[model samples]
Target: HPDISVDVLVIGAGPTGLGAAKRLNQIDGPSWMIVDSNETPGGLASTDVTPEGFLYDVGGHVIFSHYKYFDDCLDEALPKEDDWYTHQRISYVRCQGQWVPAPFQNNISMLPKEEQVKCIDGMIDAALEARVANTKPKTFDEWIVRMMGTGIADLFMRPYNFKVWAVPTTKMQCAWLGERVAAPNLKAVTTNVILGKTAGNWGPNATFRFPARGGTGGIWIAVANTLPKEKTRFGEKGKVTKVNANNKTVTLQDGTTIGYKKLVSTMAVDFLAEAMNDQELVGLTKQLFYSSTHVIGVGVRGSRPERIGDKCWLYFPEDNCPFYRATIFSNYSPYNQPEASAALPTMQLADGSRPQSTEAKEGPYWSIMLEVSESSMKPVNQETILADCIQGLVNTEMLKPTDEIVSTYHRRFDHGYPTPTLEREGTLTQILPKLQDKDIWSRGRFGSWRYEVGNQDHSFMLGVEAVDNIVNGAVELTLNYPDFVNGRQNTERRLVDGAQVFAKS
Candidate 1:
């Protein structure tokens, strides 16, 4: 016998689940509820607080929305002038002992003379090849060489993406690279190289906003708070142990069973398959592949360094750093760490040497958050990662050898990234429809397994659209056409007065 029942059952209280709940509440039609194993909201998009009072997000997450409804929801949650900090993205690439302007293909002038010529020579060759080439590049490596030429691929694209994805470019597909990457303009790049100038900041997130208080996690927590408390269950009580697709019910860790007409699962699809105990579904999940992520954060006892400046984030392509990207988390908000007056003892110096004194000291503090990828292809030493990352900071010149480290954070998420492998499209095409045919809508970053539409904005919309599809037969544009939604500002659905708003209809 079912302890409870609903028209729809949503899993995972991250952005996607919350998005489903928001739509359900707005429509006032479906008898629905959302659940998550976490005590709080924000799954991968959540934040972590250190024992000494420092904040770190899952990775480098920024809100460059493709949908206005996403903007409306966040604005409604964190609705105050002082509640947010808007800033231009000061981004750079650490290369050859110098900070090169990002979109490195357009900034070859910043490279050493010989390196610049090599990149430019390749760009010319790529452009010439484009004129005669009739077919699309099959792999990401092929795409990189075709679009950027061999020079930039060897210098930045190949190595940097390897660090980020933990998968070789040859094994990945190129279809997912729509607006997510910055394409270099041959004319502009050649002119800049000749004039010895760098290109301006480029791409979708050239400018973004950060929450003033709780880091990225704070945003989702606030959004969750807006929902009806009774409609949500988190922690153990919300933990789903099994999914009886035949009966259309899910049993929670508490042994309480709930029935639903339709289910929206946002957990990793692989994990969801195990819950259902469906052999066919489980077998399909094996074809899909993903990489793990290690987020390491370091808090230092000092004022913001001039060398780091107001830079929001920096990309590393070389092996000097185990990390692919680093963010000046402290610069995003003054509240990201403990107040300057809060005294804290030095944990160690950047080089791992003990501090001169064990006593607590204070006045100023700053922090850096890093991301490292892991997989069978690129395994990491879990024990030495923190220390190696710290030494990497020193090598990259982000930290001085004598710089005092006040606090540290290191965590690993097994399902970090949804790798768009060569077999990804074929796998998702079969698995998604098969699950949907059973009245199960599996969607999200890992749920839908499409990295192209896997940002905070796209993930949120995937849920919203799923609910709409369940209730009103609305087209899942973001799911079906990643290129369509990503290519333009999605104004079809809105939270306020709009032509195409998803009403109770």
Candidate 2:
């Protein structure tokens, strides 16, 4: 006999799953249950607290939301004015010992004289060719050259993206670059290079908000709290052991089997297939490659460095750093570290050597969070990643050798960023439809496997839209049209006001 049955069984309590639950509860239509392997609700969107009382998000998530429903949910969850911290996104790229504005293509003027000349020359050529060129660029690398020119491609776009994605640009497709990449205006770039003008802010996340108390995960936990508790399950006890799509039943680690008419799986698509016991689907999922993420956090016993003053996140492309991006984590919130009076002993120096003073000291502390992406193709020095990252901080001038390290955090997520490989679309096109036809909506960061819309907000909407599709036959806009949603100001839907509209419709 089944342990329980519901109209909808949502798997994985991340943004997507919670989104499903939120819609189910809001509409009060279709009984539903949500489950996750994690004890906490936040999946990748969750936060990790250090033993010494420091918090870091899963690789420095910033809220640059594109949906109104997402804002409503967050506002309802963390409603108090004190629950949030709004900050201007002061981001940059550490290139050849200089802080170049991000979207490196837009700021080639930051490069050395000869390199700037080369970039401008290529930009002119690309601009001239673009006027007459009829066909679209075939690959991301080609798109870079066509859009920014060979100079920027060789100097920044190619190398930096390789470090971030852990995949060569040549292997990626350009269709994902709706608002992510800033295609340099050839005339402007040339003029900037000649006039030595620095480019201003560009891209989607020029300004973003962070939670005041907890890391990014805190937001989701609060969101989960607003939902019906009995309906949500997390941690190992909440872990799903098997998913019988044919039988419409989900078996949890506790041996409780809950049957459902429809399933919205937010877990990794690859793992979901395995749990379903579909060998063919599993094999197809294997074709979708991904890189693991290692988030290394360092807490230092000192005031925030002036060099790293209020910097949001900095990108690193050169081999001088083991990480692709490093966030001035402590800058995001004053509570990110213990108070200066908290008297914490130095674990070691930044170089991993014994501290000059062994005695415990109190007062100010600051922290840094570093993100490293690793795949089979781009292996990491796991044994020395922490050490390498500390050294990288010094190399990037973010830390001094004598800086006292109070605490350190290192964690690896097996399925980090889903690689948008050349074959991703081919596999997703087949897998997504096959599962949906079975009344299963496998969607989320790794669930849908589309990086463009795999963020917390997007993931949440993916579930909300999936539920909408199942209940009201509404189109899954975020899932079906990522480029469309990403390219424009998606205001067609609203949380506070649209619930009635959908109900009426």
Best by TM-score: 1
Lowest lDDT 10-mer window, candidate 2? 175-184
Q: Quote the lDDT for 11 in model 1.
A: 94
Report the number of the highest-lDDT candidate.
1
TM-score of decoy 2: 0.95
lDDT of 2 at 86: 75
Instruction: Tell me how candidate 1 scores on lDDT.
Output: 0.90
Worst 10 residues of 1 by lDDT: 496-505
Each prediction's Cα lDDT score?
A: 0.90, 0.85
The sequence of per-residue lDDT tens digits that candidate 2 reaches over residues 274-309 is 999999999999999899999999999877777777
- Residues 235-313, model 1: lDDT tens digits: 9999999999999999999998999999999999999999999889899998899999999999999999899888888
